[PDB]
């Protein structure tokens, strides 16, 4: 398929790797009894391994010649061959949480900046204001775009300190 | 018979001893800087040590060089 | 022979660590480079780039170097 | 020898002279500040370059500057 | 031809390693400590 | 009192301490900082230095040729260049015992010799050298040329021979002569040598100075060139069964563009190289008539610079005044030259390993590894030098009043934005590459290799598919048979090129995977961080908020004292100093990647690299620990072999590196106090105080300490990696 | 005010001696001599290490560099409220008075002093290095 | 961690202060500059951080090597 890779559901090395992991786990399990805590723990780990391999093959991931999955970072290839869940959707998810945290911190700084002692509000966190801004940050992309359109997101050149060149 | 415990215990106690020795030197220097008073140490052992500190350091430096040569050169 | 050589290595490293710590203890108040080191305290970075450079003249820096030598020795 | 210079921003606070450990700086009369005094460096031949005077200067930017020059016996602070 | 003799390394290696460096070191050391008039 | 040394600095000569010798040795080439230095004298001194350097280079080349002709086995290596190891020179060491003598006695010699890794054998054999007489004649000729250059360097400093100041500033004439003469005529002469000597010698015909005036390089004899039927020169080329050095299957063509590599030597065709040099010679000669010097026609670089300002005012004044700030600043020209040279050096390393130009060079694995690593480290040092000289230009030769509103002033206008964005790129690359590596390491440690993140490098693989590689399956541009780009080269060079790029047995566009993607990101991190340190040091060299007057202190100075919280490593020299470590680390990563990928390719198991290059444990165990077993076994209680010298060099580099750590961690003050105690000890010792010093012993300066520690760090780093690389590649193959 | 004359027959503080004393520079290049007047006997700290006892009245000491003499001067002024003064002595016997230069300490302003090495401008008003390039030797933009 | 120590032991706070100034400019542009002015670590703090990381990295390296080896073959 893409870049000479084969799907994990039809790769021989993938199945051999799964059999290798299950074989070493079963080999470690043969030394214990049947109704003991280590045996139950090993069986739980084996079930987790089976579920993980089944879920990875079910997701349609592309495996290589080593039997391990590969991620598709190109937006066109991901949206064209059903690989948007690898690197596209998590990218936008991180962008939302990253801008979320950044906007919450920026709002807290700008809010405490006009007070009498901002340094005290920086070392001793004002939990009520921080909690209110944390709950209000859900609309961070909308607020950031509206701030950018109004011209209030950036500071002017004359109000920023610079070197003597 | 537990080689792991023996090796780990020896190494751990040795490291603690070395760190404590370095701390001892540090606090000796702290005392010499803050709590030392020359009005009560006119002609005692500490004053004489400070008086010939150059000789002490020079001989210790020479023995360090001699030991380094005869230890690493081999 | 190997035991003899490694024992001399240990003695040399111990002597160097002692040299750094003892030098930082005896020369903590004053030295031939800075006669008023006691006025600068126990823990200070330097006395400026003057006199060719006075980087790490405090007793704290001697403890800092003794830590590395103790690590090497141990 | 090192080059020690005094600029016109000196407020005559006399802190740089007290911080000098080899008696290089001094105070002379002046008419550019309220204290009517100004720092001077007439014995730069004895300066080592410790920059204690720069540390003790409170003006922004500094009024006393030290530039490392030719090294000698007095400038290197050697007792031998 | 330009081929050196068989004994050439046995004479040029000790020369370049002991004769030339000693003479060069002594000459340079004397030159550095020369006092100006 | 005042000493004679140094003669260029009376202030340093009056220094009565040991600092005088070190500073005089480290400031001898700083011509601008001497006593009584003018512009004309400065340029003349640089001219003499250039001649002396050229003489040294030519003498070194002649020495290599002479030693290969004397103690080497070039006459026997040409007959069997696959199973015979090249010999560098003999070894005459009285310290060697009997086992060392028989251990180093290899390569068919009669005594202890060194096996060369420089690759001069393949290069000389490809250009036409066959007998030792040729090497001897070349060595004698190069020695005489070096002597002439030395005499020229001495002659140009005497009166009636010193060039004027205006002569050194003739940019138009110098650039026209270098583009047309030093570049075009030299390339044309090389084409003449390839067509007249290299091509006939590779086909079994000995052509030398005694018979080249009577042997025709082509059966048509210059007629198709004058009649414009140049296509007749590419007729009847070397067939696929041609044997290098003999006439078996040899063609009669002299200028072709078959492409690919030779089937036997696995190197570039000589006819294609000759055709290449001819085309670039024509291009360089034509480009040599672009600037107006003395005949009215041509251009003026000042006019082209001043006539390149956008009307929107985006670049401010554009390039106005750039001609004066560059022609009058030697540091700017040196920085530009070093930047271009470093980039070209990296280009040379990549093109030589991927496209082997010398015969039987691909089979020599040690030659490839050593040459690539050598050129990459040299390029890294040269790049750091380019940025260092740029900082020197800002501190010493920048004039804000002359460069008002141009691109140069606008660089310092928004330097904070540049440093901030470089910091963001470096931070992002470092966090992500380290995070992915640690994640893969944890997955491999927990027994779940399928859980690690392996991003397929689809962009570089897409580029490879565009070049003609069909392994991925994109099938476009040169990969698709119905494309115009593919059908337009099928009659000129695409057959050989496609046959060579699709073959997985060469180094021409190797297959890449997630490990290659990750290590490429590490390379990008190293490049961006090194650029960040160098760029920040060059832009902040004239001053910042911490030191508003850093331009008045020079390029290199210790610090500004402990005031204002501390000003350690505030000069631009210190920025370069911290950047050298990042350059060494970046080149270390690129050379590690090259060595491991090629080692796994030569061993026939590329899957080992593809599966262990995603986690750092694989790099530490399967590459650094697995390939050093033979290196550290050079000498042991059971005896020694020829690999003991590399083991000694390995430990030597480790010792030098650790010694550099001392100058890097411990600082001056402690050492000065210790020295004072030693001074007292010597002055108060009988039978020894009679011998007094002529220079007062003092501790090394801060700048000198940084330089000494950096030098030891770099020397140990280079020697350690070179020893490990050569030992592992030589023992494995 | 008159420049003081060095009295070599001046009693010295009772000190047992140390290894941080004078070196060959005191006999080959120069050395320094610090003198002061003490109202009573008192144990003080030597700048080269050790504790000495300053005598009542005149007290003289020898040091290798000027920094040691000024450090002892500062210690005596700030801990015991005295007025010390020092000279630089050459091997030929020449004595040169150094501090205080005019008899008045430099922290306070005194009439008759002339300011030297003073720039009647600020740091930001200095010229670029390109303007001071190609001089007789390495010259900083602040030297002019 | 050990190699991380080399970042604090081979460099100085002046470079880091200027780099922090550039980062502060980036913050000031987007009005995200904290009221507490970010200052680089002090010289003494840089030395302490470097020696702490050096000791932790080396000691942890030897600890892992000794424990893994003595547990596997002991
Ligand atoms: C971050 C850098 C980056 C890089 C290095 C690439 C690289 C690539 N992209 Mg791309 N892309 C990017 C960002 C990037 N993209 C972003 C941010 C977006 C969101 C707008 C897209 C959305 C996108 C689409 C929709 C497509 C690609 C495609 C491609 C591949 C070929 C096209 C091309 O090179 O032109 C650059 C790509 C663009 C300018 C986007 C427009 C698509 C162009 C016009 C190509 C479409 C023509 C045709 C489908 C090509 C296929 C020929 C053949 C294989 C059938 C190539 C490997 C194509 C592909 O291979 O499909 C799987 C494809 O159709 N990308
Ligand atoms: C009985 C033991 C003892 C005691 C009571 C003291 C007491 C004191 N020491 Mg001292 N010292 C000791 C041992 C001791 N020390 C040892 C063993 C060493 C060698 C390392 C030192 C070296 C030393 C120096 C160099 C200095 C002191 C100083 C001081 C004084 C200030 C307190 C302080 O350090 O600041 C606060 C304490 C801290 C900030 C704790 C630091 C935390 C460290 C860095 C973390 C350790 C790593 C940890 C083990 C691993 C964690 C893993 C990580 C992933 C979380 C204080 C009176 C200082 C001083 O003289 O004051 C002027 C001084 O500069 N000590
Ligand atoms: C492997 C690196 C290295 C080496 C070789 C040294 C070496 C030395 N250190 Mg050092 N140190 C290091 C790392 C190193 N250190 C680091 C990283 C730090 C930072 C924490 C320090 C901090 C430090 C301090 C604080 C002190 C030293 C001191 C010393 C000296 C001790 C005297 C001695 O050992 O006698 C013998 C010398 C050696 C063993 C060095 C190697 C000599 C070789 C083996 C001999 C070869 C001779 C050869 C024939 C020469 C021919 C040359 C030819 C080309 C002509 C010694 C020269 C102490 C000192 O000043 O001296 C008392 C001191 O107090 N070091
Ligand atoms: C510092 C450690 C060290 C020591 C103890 C030795 C010792 C020795 N080496 Mg060796 N070597 C060393 C380091 C060392 N080496 C290093 C670091 C290297 C690598 C560069 C080498 C490389 C090397 C080579 C290549 C060779 C040796 C050889 C030798 C042997 C003979 C050397 C000789 O005869 O010279 C002569 C020595 C002297 C003239 C002076 C001796 C010092 C005297 C005894 C001290 C006097 C002080 C006295 C106490 C003062 C009293 C005070 C007053 C009351 C009088 C010898 C046993 C040779 C060998 O292999 O032998 C088989 C030889 O071939 N070494
Ligand atoms: C820069 C080139 C170069 C280099 C790196 C070497 C290196 C070497 N030569 Mg070789 N040599 C060279 C050029 C060179 N040679 C040339 C051009 C000739 C022809 C005249 C010779 C003739 C020669 C002979 C006959 C022998 C060597 C031998 C050797 C080896 C022993 C050490 C030695 O220096 O011997 C001596 C080197 C010379 C006599 C050449 C010096 C003559 C040139 C013109 C002087 C150059 C001055 C220099 C640039 C100034 C700066 C150097 C320094 C002062 C800073 C050594 C590996 C010996 C050997 O084979 O060991 C096994 C040996 O017997 N060489
Ligand atoms: C770079 C050039 C160079 C050369 C050519 C030599 C050559 C030699 N070295 Mg030497 N060495 C060197 C560098 C060099 N070394 C360096 C850089 C170091 C420091 C790492 C050493 C450290 C060293 C040691 C420790 C020893 C040697 C020894 C020897 C001798 C080997 C003994 C032997 O088996 O033969 C047979 C021996 C003989 C035939 C006796 C010859 C007597 C001398 C060497 C020649 C006559 C002296 C001559 C008149 C004076 C020359 C001085 C001149 C510069 C003015 C040999 C002649 C060994 C030795 O000295 O032998 C006892 C030994 O102990 N070397
Ligand atoms: C056609 C006339 C001509 C020619 C042939 C030259 C030639 C040269 N001039 Mg010159 N010059 C000229 C006219 C000319 N000049 C005029 C008219 C002026 C006055 C306006 C000047 C003013 C001038 C100055 C001020 C200087 C020179 C210098 C030089 C030397 C440069 C040294 C060098 O970089 O190596 C040669 C460089 C190359 C051959 C180009 C290499 C191209 C890339 C980098 C390499 C690619 C090639 C290939 C891939 C590598 C080979 C691989 C393998 C074989 C190893 C060089 C020999 C310098 C000098 O004097 O040195 C003593 C210098 O300072 N010239
Ligand atoms: C065409 C190349 C070129 C040229 C002409 C120059 C020219 C100049 N440089 Mg420069 N530079 C270059 C490339 C170049 N550089 C490169 C590639 C780097 C990166 C490494 C640098 C980094 C650099 C810095 C940081 C500085 C200069 C400076 C200077 C100026 C004077 C200092 C000097 O050279 O004195 C003489 C040079 C030396 C004495 C070299 C020092 C000794 C080294 C460390 C040798 C160590 C090697 C070691 C012994 C190897 C042996 C190992 C073995 C024994 C095991 C001068 C105009 C200085 C300056 O501008 O002054 C303000 C300055 O500070 N350069
Ligand atoms: C292994 C050693 C090491 C490491 C990791 C670094 C790392 C870094 N260097 Mg550095 N450097 C080093 C050695 C090292 N250096 C040495 C020896 C020198 C020569 C003195 C330099 C000189 C140097 C300069 C001059 C500069 C850097 C810069 C940087 C930063 C580059 C940005 C980046 O890549 O983001 C990635 C971030 C990281 C890799 C940080 C590590 C992330 C950690 C492991 C995560 C935290 C762990 C966990 C969550 C919490 C554990 C803590 C626990 C106590 C609770 C980066 C943090 C540049 C810079 O500042 O960039 C702006 C800069 O200008 N370096
Ligand atoms: C600091 C400083 C400086 C600067 C420096 C620098 C700037 C460096 C760098 C850098 C570098 C080192 C760069 C480089 C670059 C490169 C480039 C820019 C390129 C490119 C590309 C292209 C354009 C291509 C294209 C293509 C392709 C894609 C492929 C195929 C072919 C073709 C052609 C199509 C100086 C000294 C001046 C002075 C001032 C200061
Ligand atoms: S500290 Fe600065 S402002 Fe105050 S007197 Fe001295 S030079 Fe003038
Ligand atoms: Ca021939």
UniProtKB/Swiss-Prot annotation, chain A:
Parent-record interval covered: 63 to 227 of 227
The keyword ATP-binding is annotated on this UniProt entry: no
Keyword line: Chloroplast, Photosynthesis, Photosystem I, Plastid, Thylakoid, Transit peptide
Single GO cellular component term: chloroplast thylakoid lumen
Physiological role: Probably participates in efficiency of electron transfer from plastocyanin to P700 (or cytochrome c553 in algae and cyanobacteria). This plastocyanin-docking protein contributes to the specific association of plastocyanin to PSI.
Record-given protein name: Photosystem I reaction center subunit III, chloroplastic
Compartment annotation: Plastid, Chloroplast thylakoid lumen
GO BP term, pick one: photosynthesis
Family from the record: Belongs to the PsaF family.
Keyword Chloroplast appears in the UniProt entry: yes
Curated annotation (Swiss-Prot), chain C:
Binding site for [4Fe-4S] cluster: 46, 55
Superkingdom in the source lineage: Eukaryota
Location within or outside the cell: Plastid, Chloroplast thylakoid membrane
Membrane-traversing stretches: 4-22
Self-association state and partner proteins as the record states: The PsaA/B heterodimer binds the P700 chlorophyll special pair and subsequent electron acceptors. PSI consists of a core antenna complex that captures photons, and an electron transfer chain that converts photonic excitation into a charge separation. The eukaryotic PSI reaction center is composed of at least 11 subunits.
UniProt similarity note: Belongs to the PsaA/PsaB family.
Record's function text: PsaA and PsaB bind P700, the primary electron donor of photosystem I (PSI), as well as the electron acceptors A0, A1 and FX. PSI is a plastocyanin/cytochrome c6-ferredoxin oxidoreductase, converting photonic excitation into a charge separation, which transfers an electron from the donor P700 chlorophyll pair to the spectroscopically characterized acceptors A0, A1, FX, FA and FB in turn. Oxidized P700 is reduced on the lumenal side of the thylakoid membrane by plastocyanin or cytochrome c6. Both potential cofactor branches in PSI seem to be active; however, electron transfer seems to proceed preferentially down the path including the phylloquinone bound by PsaA.
Name the record gives this protein: Photosystem I P700 chlorophyll a apoprotein A1
Name of the gene: psaA
Residues of the full protein shown: 530 to 603 of 751
Curated annotation (Swiss-Prot), chain D:
Residues noted as binding [4Fe-4S] cluster 1 in the record, renumbered to the chain: 10, 13, 16, 57
Protein name per its UniProtKB record: Photosystem I iron-sulfur center
GO molecular function, one term: oxidoreductase activity
Database matches in InterPro entries: 4Fe4S_Fe-S-bd, 4Fe4S_Fe_S_CS, PSI_iron-sulfur_center, PSI_PsaC
Assembly mode: The eukaryotic PSI reaction center is composed of at least 11 subunits.
Catalysed transformations (reactions): reduced [plastocyanin] + hnu + oxidized [2Fe-2S]-[ferredoxin] = oxidized [plastocyanin] + reduced [2Fe-2S]-[ferredoxin]
GO annotation, biological process: photosynthesis; photosynthetic electron transport in photosystem I
Key words of the record: 4Fe-4S, Chloroplast, Electron transport, Iron, Iron-sulfur, Membrane, Metal-binding, Oxidoreductase, Photosynthesis, Photosystem I, Plastid, Repeat, Thylakoid, Transport
Native organism taxonomy: Eukaryota, Viridiplantae, Chlorophyta, core chlorophytes, Chlorophyceae
From Swiss-Prot, chain G:
Localization of this protein: Plastid, Chloroplast thylakoid membrane
Coiled-coil blocks: none
UniProt keyword list: Chloroplast, Membrane, Photosynthesis, Photosystem I, Plastid, Thylakoid, Transit peptide
GO cellular component entries: chloroplast thylakoid membrane; photosystem I reaction center
Membrane-topology annotation of the record: Peripheral membrane protein
Family, as annotated: Belongs to the PsaD family.
Name of the protein: Photosystem I reaction center subunit II, chloroplastic
Organism: Chlamydomonas reinhardtii (Chlamydomonas smithii)
């Amino acid at each position: 398929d893409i870049a000479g890779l084969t799907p994990c559901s039809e790769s021989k090395a993938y199945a051999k790797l799964e059999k290798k992991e299950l074989k070493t786990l079963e080999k470690r399990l043969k030394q214990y009894e049947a109704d003991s805590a280590p045996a139950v723990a090993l069986k739980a780990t084996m079930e987790r391994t089976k579920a993980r391999f089944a879920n990875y093959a079910k997701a349609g991931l592309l495996c290589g010649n080593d039997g391990l999955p590969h991620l598709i970072a190109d937006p066109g290839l991901a949206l064209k061959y059903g690989h948007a869940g690898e690197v596209f959707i998590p990218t936008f998810g991180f962008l939302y949480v990253a801008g979320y945290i950044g906007y919450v911190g920026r709002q807290y700084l700008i809010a405490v900046k006009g007070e009498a002692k901002p340094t005290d509000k920086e070392i001793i966190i004002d939990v009520p204001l921080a909690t209110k801004l944390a709950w209000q940050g859900a609309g961070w992309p909308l607020a950031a775009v509206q701030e950018l359109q109004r011209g209030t997101l950036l500071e002017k050149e004359e109000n920023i300190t610079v070197s003597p060149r | 018979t537990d080689y792991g415990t023996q090796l780990s215990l020896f190494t751990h106690h040795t490291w603690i001893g070395g760190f404590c020795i370095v701390g001892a030197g540090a606090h000796a220097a702290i005392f010499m800087v803050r709590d030392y008073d020359p009005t009560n140490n006119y002609n005692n052992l500490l004053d004489r040590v400070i008086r010939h500190r150059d000789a002490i350091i020079s001989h210790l430096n020479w023995v360090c060089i001699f030991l380094g040569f005869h230890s690493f050169g081999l | 022979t190997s035991d003899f050589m490694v024992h001399h290595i240990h003695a040399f490293t111990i002597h160097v660590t002692v040299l750094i710590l003892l030098k930082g203890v005896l020369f903590a108040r004053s030295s031939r480079l800075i006669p008023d080191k006691a006025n600068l305290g126990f823990r200070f970075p330097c006395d400026g780039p003057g006199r060719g450079g006075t980087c790490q003249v405090s007793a704290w820096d001697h403890v800092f170097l003794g830590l590395f030598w103790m690590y090497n020795s141990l | 020898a090192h080059i020690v210079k005094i600029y016109d921003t000196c407020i005559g606070c006399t802190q740089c002279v007290r911080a000098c450990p080899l008696d290089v700086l001094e105070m002379v009369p002046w008419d550019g500040c309220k204290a009517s005094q100004m720092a001077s460096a007439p014995r730069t031949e004895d300066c080592v370059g410790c920059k204690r005077c720069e540390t003790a200067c409170p003006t922004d930017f500094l009024s006393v500057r030290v530039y490392l020059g030719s090294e000698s016996t007095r400038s290197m602070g050697l007792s031998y | 031809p330009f081929v050196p003799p068989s004994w050439a390394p046995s004479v040029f290696v000790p020369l370049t390693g002991l004769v030339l460096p000693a003479i060069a070191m002594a000459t340079l050391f004397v030159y550095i400590e020369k006092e100006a008039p | 009192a005042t000493k004679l040394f140094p003669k260029f600095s009376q202030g340093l000569a009056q220094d009565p301490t040991t600092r005088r010798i070190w500073y005089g040795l480290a400031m001898a080439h700083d011509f601008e900082s001497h006593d009584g230095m003018t512009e004309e004298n400065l340029y003349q001194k640089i001219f003499a230095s250039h001649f002396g350097q050229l003489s040294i280079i030519f003498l070194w080349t002649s020495g290599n040729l002479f030693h290969v002709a004397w103690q080497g086995n070039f006459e026997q290596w040409v007959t069997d260049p696959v199973h015979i190891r090249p010999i560098a020179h003999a070894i005459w060491d009285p310290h060697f015992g009997q086992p060392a003598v028989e251990a180093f006695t290899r390569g068919g010699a009669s005594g202890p010799v060194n096996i060369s890794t420089s690759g001069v054998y393949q290069w000389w054999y490809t250009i036409g050298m066959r007998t030792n007489q040729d090497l001897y004649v070349g060595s004698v000729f190069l020695a005489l040329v070096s002597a002439i250059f030395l005499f020229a360097g001495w002659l140009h400093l005497q009166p009636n021979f010193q060039p004027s100041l205006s002569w050194f500033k003739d940019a138009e004439s110098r650039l026209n002569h270098h583009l047309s003469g030093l570049f075009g005529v030299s390339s044309l002469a090389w084409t003449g040598h390839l067509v007249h000597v290299a091509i006939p010698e590779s086909r079994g015909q000995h052509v030398g100075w005694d018979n080249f005036l009577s042997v025709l390089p082509h059966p048509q004899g210059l007629t198709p060139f004058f009649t414009g039927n140049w296509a007749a020169y590419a007729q009847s080329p070397d067939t696929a069964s041609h044997v290098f050095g003999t006439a078996q299957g040899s063609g009669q063509a002299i200028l072709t563009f078959l492409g690919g590599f030779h089937p036997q030597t696995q190197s570039l065709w000589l006819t294609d190289m000759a055709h290449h040099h001819l085309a670039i010679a024509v291009i360089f000669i034509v480009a040599g008539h672009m600037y107006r010097t003395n005949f009215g026609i041509g251009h003026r670089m000042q006019a082209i610079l001043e006539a390149h300002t956008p009307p929107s005012g985006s670049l401010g004044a554009g390039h106005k005044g750039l001609f004066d700030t560059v022609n009058n600043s030697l540091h700017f020209q040196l920085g530009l030259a070093l930047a271009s040279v470093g980039t070209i050096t990296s280009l040379v390393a990549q093109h030589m390993y991927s496209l082997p130009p010398y015969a039987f060079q691909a089979i020599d694995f040690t030659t490839q590894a050593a040459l690539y690593t050598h050129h990459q480290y040299i390029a890294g040092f040269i790049m750091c030098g380019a940025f260092a000289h740029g900082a020197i230009f800002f501190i010493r030769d920048y004039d804000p009043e002359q460069n008002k509103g141009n691109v140069l002033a606008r660089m310092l206008d928004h330097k904070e934005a540049l440093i901030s964005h470089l910091s963001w790129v470096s931070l992002f690359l470092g966090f992500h590459t380290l995070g992915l590596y640690v994640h893969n390491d944890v997955m491999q440690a927990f027994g779940t290799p399928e859980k690690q993140i392996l991003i397929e490098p689809v962009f570089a693989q897409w580029i490879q598919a565009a070049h003609g590689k069909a392994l991925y399956g994109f099938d476009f541009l040169l990969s698709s048979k119905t494309s115009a780009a593919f059908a337009n080269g099928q009659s000129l060079w695409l057959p050989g090129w496609l046959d060579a790029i699709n073959n997985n047995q060469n180094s021409l566009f190797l297959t890449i995977g997630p490990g290659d993607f990750l290590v490429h990101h590490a390379i990008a991190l190293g490049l961006h961080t090194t650029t960040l340190i160098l760029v920040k040091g060059a832009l902040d060299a004239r001053g910042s908020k911490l030191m508003p007057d850093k331009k008045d202190f020079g390029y290199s100075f210790p610090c500004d004292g402990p005031g204002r919280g501390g000003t350690c490593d505030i000069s631009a020299y210190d920025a370069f100093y911290l950047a050298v470590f990042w350059m060494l680390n970046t080149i270390g990563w690129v050379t590690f990647y090259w060595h491991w990928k090629h080692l796994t390719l030569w061993q026939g198991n590329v899957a080992q690299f593809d599966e262990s290059s995603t986690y750092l444990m694989g790099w530490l165990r399967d590459y650094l620990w697995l390939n050093s077993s033979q290196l550290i076994n050079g000498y042991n209680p059971f005896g020694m072999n020829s690999l003991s010298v590399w083991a000694w060099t390995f430990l030597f580099g480790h010792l030098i590196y650790a010694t550099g750590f001392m100058f890097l961690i411990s600082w001056r003050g402690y050492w000065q106090e210790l020295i004072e105690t030693l001074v007292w000890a010597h002055e108060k010792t009988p039978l020894a105080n009679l011998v007094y010093w002529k220079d007062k012993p003092v501790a090394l300066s801060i700048v000198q300490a940084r330089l000494v520690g950096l030098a030891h760090f770099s020397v140990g780093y280079i020697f350690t990696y070179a020893a490990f690389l050569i030992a592992s590649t030589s023992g494995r193959f | 005010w008159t420049v003081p004359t060095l009295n070599p027959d001046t009693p010295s503080p009772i000190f047992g001696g140390s290894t941080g004393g004078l070196l060959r520079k005191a006999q080959t290049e120069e050395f320094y001599v610090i003198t002061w007047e003490a109202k009573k006997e008192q144990i003080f700290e030597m700048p080269t290490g050790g504790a000495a006892i300053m005598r009542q009245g005149p007290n003289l000491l020898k040091f290798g560099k000027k920094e040691q003499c000024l450090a002892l001067t500062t210690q005596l002024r700030n801990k015991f409220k005295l007025t010390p003064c020092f000279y630089r002595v050459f091997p030929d016997g020449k004595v040169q008075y150094l501090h205080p230069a005019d008899g008045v300490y430099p922290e306070k302003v005194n009439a008759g002093r002339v300011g030297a090495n003073q720039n009647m401008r600020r740091i930001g008003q200095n010229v670029n290095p390109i303007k001071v390039k190609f001089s007789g030797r390495m010259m900083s933009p602040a030297e002019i | 961690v050990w190699a991380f120590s080399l970042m604090f032991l081979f460099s100085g706070r002046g470079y880091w202060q200027e780099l922090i100034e550039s980062i502060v400019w980036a913050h000031n542009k987007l009005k995200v500059a904290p009221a507490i002015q970010p200052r680089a670590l002090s010289i003494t703090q840089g030395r302490a951080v470097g020696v702490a990381h050096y000791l932790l990295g080396g000691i942890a390296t030897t600890w892992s090597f000794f424990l893994a080896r003595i547990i596997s073959v002991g």
